[PDB]
Amino acid sequence: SVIKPEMKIKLRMEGAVNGHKFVIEGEGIGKPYEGTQTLDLTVEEGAPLPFSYDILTPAFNRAFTKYPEDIPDYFKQAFPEGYSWERSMTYEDQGICIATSDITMEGDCFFYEIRFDGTNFPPNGPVMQKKTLKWKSPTGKMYVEDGVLKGDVEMALLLEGGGHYRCDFKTTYKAKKDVRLPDAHEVDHRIEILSHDKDYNKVRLYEHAEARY
């Protein structure tokens, strides 16, 4: 396979949230067959970010998923050519984000070109007031609709003071070439900010992910 036991990551995200433009760059490494990865992220433009960093982190690659051999791996099959995704993230207080990522590969390194846009977050809401702690770890569903791979997951951010803040994720995936399509299945994720500086200009981000029926 062209996916090595260890793969590097390089990315660039450009976007805007409630009109505030930003650019974030990332460099990392992961073990695709183990489903693990770590990213170091740097706010290159638009610092300091006036919104919760947590809304960004699921945008920062399902190739880093442990797939059982009896479930076809859409994401590892898509390389070297790559794949893209389109995602809507609909929060319970009418804040909405939409994002896209084009994922390519050159040598032992993935490259992401990410666009992230968000709007209509309440000014005194948990996102613009930075009251989010971390994402819960729900199980997401993967399924195919007329030859296209889709994902749906009901997400939630834990809040300061003990509450939770929900978000509906819908993703569409597109391999550059035809690959074996999997039957419907699930993916477990855990995503965590391991470290950050005061205003999250620097962030170290970790994900573990595993597929199952």
Side-chain angles (χ1 to χ4, degrees):
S1 170
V2 79
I3 303 302
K4 306 292 173 44
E6 216 170 38
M7 292 289 288
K8 286 176 184 58
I9 305 162
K10 296 179 176 95
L11 68 86
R12 179 176 182 280
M13 175 190 283
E14 182 167 25
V17 173
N18 280 21
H20 186 93
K21 300 186 180 63
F22 62 90
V23 176
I24 292 166
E25 291 181 342
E27 285 184 85
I29 189 160
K31 298 179 139 189
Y33 301 95
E34 303 272 34
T36 58
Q37 49 164 140
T38 310
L39 275 165
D40 292 314
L41 302 155
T42 308
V43 176
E44 205 53 41
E45 303 181 13
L49 298 175
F51 57 82
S52 167
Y53 206 92
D54 290 317
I55 71 171
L56 301 174
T57 53
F60 294 127
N61 176 17
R62 284 275 58 75
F64 292 104
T65 308
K66 183 163 143 291
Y67 263 86
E69 60 168 20
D70 65 330
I71 303 178
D73 192 336
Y74 183 89
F75 305 103
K76 293 191 182 67
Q77 284 183 94
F79 293 91
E81 290 85 350
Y83 74 105
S84 60
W85 57 254
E86 294 176 18
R87 185 176 291 158
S88 66
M89 294 154 281
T90 297
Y91 290 89
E92 59 166 83
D93 62 354
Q94 305 191 314
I96 300 168
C97 301
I98 52 172
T100 64
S101 188
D102 198 49
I103 297 170
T104 52
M105 188 199 74
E106 209 180 1
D108 70 334
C109 189
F110 297 114
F111 298 85
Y112 321 158
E113 170 184 324
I114 313 171
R115 179 71 201 187
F116 190 101
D117 293 277
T119 184
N120 287 89
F121 286 105
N124 296 320
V127 169
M128 298 310 298
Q129 293 299 316
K130 294 174 61 180
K131 298 293 180 189
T132 72
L133 301 181
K134 57 184 248 177
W135 292 99
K136 296 187 73 178
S137 298
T139 309
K141 303 182 181 189
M142 287 284 140
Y143 64 96
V144 176
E145 273 192 353
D146 284 354
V148 189
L149 187 59
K150 300 187 181 306
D152 293 329
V153 58
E154 293 175 308
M155 300 271 279
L157 284 158
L158 294 179
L159 299 183
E160 296 190 43
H164 56 277
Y165 172 61
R166 296 188 162 177
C167 185
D168 292 315
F169 277 46
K170 295 186 165 54
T171 309
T172 296
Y173 300 97
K174 298 187 64 175
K176 301 276 185 266
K177 309 308 219 68
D178 300 283
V179 301
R180 173 63 73 203
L181 304 168
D183 297 323
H185 62 277
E186 294 173 351
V187 176
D188 285 322
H189 331 248
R190 176 173 86 79
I191 188 169
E192 177 181 8
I193 291 174
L194 299 186
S195 69
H196 64 88
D197 67 347
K198 180 145 298 203
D199 287 309
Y200 289 71
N201 288 320
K202 293 168 285 298
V203 168
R204 176 172 289 241
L205 183 67
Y206 173 82
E207 192 197 6
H208 172 237
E210 297 197 8
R212 43 179 267 95
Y213 278 123

